Write an enzyme that holds these catalytic residues in place. Structure first.
Site, mmCIF file in Angstrom:
data_model
loop_
_atom_site.group_PDB
_atom_site.id
_atom_site.type_symbol
_atom_site.label_atom_id
_atom_site.label_comp_id
_atom_site.label_asym_id
_atom_site.label_seq_id
_atom_site.Cartn_x
_atom_site.Cartn_y
_atom_site.Cartn_z
ATOM 1 N N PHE A 80 41.580 66.752 2.945
ATOM 2 C CA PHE A 80 40.356 66.567 2.963
ATOM 3 C C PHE A 80 39.259 67.771 1.719
ATOM 4 O O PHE A 80 38.069 67.095 1.408
ATOM 5 C CB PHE A 80 38.855 67.520 4.556
ATOM 6 C CG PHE A 80 37.894 66.626 4.603
ATOM 7 C CD1 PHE A 80 37.140 66.716 3.696
ATOM 8 C CD2 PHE A 80 37.885 66.218 5.974
ATOM 9 C CE1 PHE A 80 36.326 65.585 4.562
ATOM 10 C CE2 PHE A 80 36.772 65.384 6.179
ATOM 11 C CZ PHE A 80 35.558 64.949 6.210
ATOM 12 N N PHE A 81 39.944 68.558 1.582
ATOM 13 C CA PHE A 81 39.330 69.511 0.893
ATOM 14 C C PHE A 81 39.002 68.433 -1.200
ATOM 15 O O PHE A 81 38.541 68.766 -1.841
ATOM 16 C CB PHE A 81 40.151 70.786 0.603
ATOM 17 C CG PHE A 81 39.074 72.047 1.157
ATOM 18 C CD1 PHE A 81 38.322 72.600 1.207
ATOM 19 C CD2 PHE A 81 39.913 72.325 2.708
ATOM 20 C CE1 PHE A 81 37.511 73.521 1.627
ATOM 21 C CE2 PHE A 81 39.421 73.165 3.308
ATOM 22 C CZ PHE A 81 37.952 73.506 3.302
ATOM 23 N N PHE A 183 30.140 67.222 7.259
ATOM 24 C CA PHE A 183 30.687 68.786 7.551
ATOM 25 C C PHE A 183 31.699 68.079 7.835
ATOM 26 O O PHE A 183 32.999 69.086 8.866
ATOM 27 C CB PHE A 183 30.195 69.616 8.127
ATOM 28 C CG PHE A 183 30.460 71.372 7.739
ATOM 29 C CD1 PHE A 183 30.824 72.055 6.888
ATOM 30 C CD2 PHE A 183 30.866 71.910 8.978
ATOM 31 C CE1 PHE A 183 31.133 73.013 6.883
ATOM 32 C CE2 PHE A 183 32.069 73.001 8.215
ATOM 33 C CZ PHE A 183 32.031 73.736 7.644
ATOM 34 N N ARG A 323 38.201 79.087 -3.499
ATOM 35 C CA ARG A 323 37.618 78.642 -3.884
ATOM 36 C C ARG A 323 36.075 78.768 -3.747
ATOM 37 O O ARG A 323 35.362 77.454 -5.083
ATOM 38 C CB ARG A 323 37.373 77.581 -2.760
ATOM 39 C CG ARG A 323 36.258 75.653 -2.903
ATOM 40 C CD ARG A 323 37.024 74.893 -1.507
ATOM 41 N NE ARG A 323 36.050 74.183 -1.422
ATOM 42 C CZ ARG A 323 36.108 72.835 -2.280
ATOM 43 N NH1 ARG A 323 37.570 72.402 -2.661
ATOM 44 N NH2 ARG A 323 36.008 71.519 -2.051
#
Ligand SMILES: CC[N+](CC)(CC)Cc1ccccc1
Ligand SMILES: [Mg+2]
Ligand SMILES: [Mg+2]
Ligand SMILES: [Mg+2]
Length: 340
Positions: A80-81, A183, A323
């Site tokens: 997902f990231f 999200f 990140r």
């Protein structure tokens, strides 16, 4: 040492961190998965993967999950990231066609992941591998709900693509609604159930206390990401952030917008504490001296416990993960872990 604009003493004092015992192997296994699925260049996996803390994030969230469930969740979440990064790069490169085709393949792979395990786009293949494994834990009724929720998530990412290409910053309320999908509020609420080993009846998971606790957990996490990722998002011409909506549409300064976002985050915590008590009272009622009632009560207690764990895991993730460390990057506008 959390910067005072980002520090939340209530989280630090009243939400102690928890860590799944499988995390040491989880970190290694997901890293190998990223390499073997070619989701990041090998040199960038080597330099950055562990420092990104993606497995730490989920191992502080789904406590009690079977190791195999946590592994699938961690692989899916790391994917997902990387999808968020691909989305960003397609936007800044203007690759409207590449994004449209990816979006279409994710919709198809979501319904039939087995068919897509070896797709030429390794990002599609990695999605299919993690989703097929997630589909192996609970009855098909849970699988269909996960699919229904993630079809909506893909289309919210497509809305974001159009916003950033057209130069549109959403209004506050339009953003708040969109953010529950970008999200993946409801995906990570769904994943509580394989983590506690039980598909919950609708009368349990749609109980107002369960539903509200699930919502507030994710709103906290989403808005705290907004607070902490604002520097790198401003540097990267991202437009989706509650702070950016406030600055753009309400003439707030940067300091004032950060203050408003923080106070909204804080209110999530204390609203959650109230509904948490109600959700655990509902759990007590479910424990009615039957095996099924003990099962449902135990599942509610575990799931609501992990809704609470999400607060502390997300909080510390944003200060530990590479990140968001924009001040350490050679180019603030181009994070070193993304494929440019
Ligand atoms: C899986 C990560 N996610 C979920 C949709 C997309 C990047 C946002 C997120 C960021 C930071 C912490 C938790 C979730
Ligand atoms: Mg992002
Ligand atoms: Mg995003
Ligand atoms: Mg963000």
């Amino acid at each position: 040492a959390v910067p005072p604009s980002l520090r939340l003493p209530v989280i630090e004092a009243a939400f102690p961190r928890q860590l799944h015992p499988y995390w040491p192997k989880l970190q290694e296994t997901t890293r190998t998965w990223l390499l073997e699925k070619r989701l990041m260049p090998a040199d960038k996996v080597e330099e950055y993967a562990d420092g990104l803390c993606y497995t730490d994030l989920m191992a502080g969230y789904y406590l009690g999950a079977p190791d195999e469930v946590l592994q699938a969740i961690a692989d899916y979440s790391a994917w997902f990231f990387v999808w968020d990064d691909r989305h960003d790069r397609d936007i800044v490169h203007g690759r409207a066609g590449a994004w449209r085709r990816l979006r279409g393949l994710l919709h198809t792979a979501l319904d039939s992941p087995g068919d897509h395990l070896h797709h030429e786009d390794t990002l599609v293949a990695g999605f299919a591998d993690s989703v097929r494994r997630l589909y192996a834990f609970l009855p098909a009724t849970w699988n269909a709900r996960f699919a229904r929720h993630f079809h909506t998530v893909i289309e919210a990412y497509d809305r974001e693509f159009h916003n950033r290409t057209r130069g549109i910053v959403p209004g506050v309320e339009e953003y708040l609604e969109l953010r529950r999908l970008t999200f993946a509020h409801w995906i990570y609420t769904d994943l509580l159930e394989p983590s506690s080993g039980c598909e919950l009846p609708d009368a349990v998971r749609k109980h107002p206390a369960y539903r509200r606790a699930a919502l507030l957990s994710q709103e906290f996490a989403a808005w705290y990401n907004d607070l902490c990722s604002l520097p790198k998002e401003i540097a990267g011409d991202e437009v989706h952030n509650l702070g950016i909506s406030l600055i753009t549409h309400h003439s707030l300064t940067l300091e004032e917008a950060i203050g408003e976002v923080r106070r909204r985050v804080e209110e999530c915590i204390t609203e959650f504490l109230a509904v948490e008590r109600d959700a655990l009272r509902f759990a007590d009622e479910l424990a009615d001296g039957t095996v099924r009632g003990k099962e449902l009560s135990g599942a509610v207690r575990a799931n609501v416990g992990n809704m609470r764990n999400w607060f502390s895991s997300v909080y510390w993730f944003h200060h530990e993960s590479g990140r968001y460390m924009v001040d350490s990057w050679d180019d603030r506008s181009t994070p070193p872990y993304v494929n440019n």
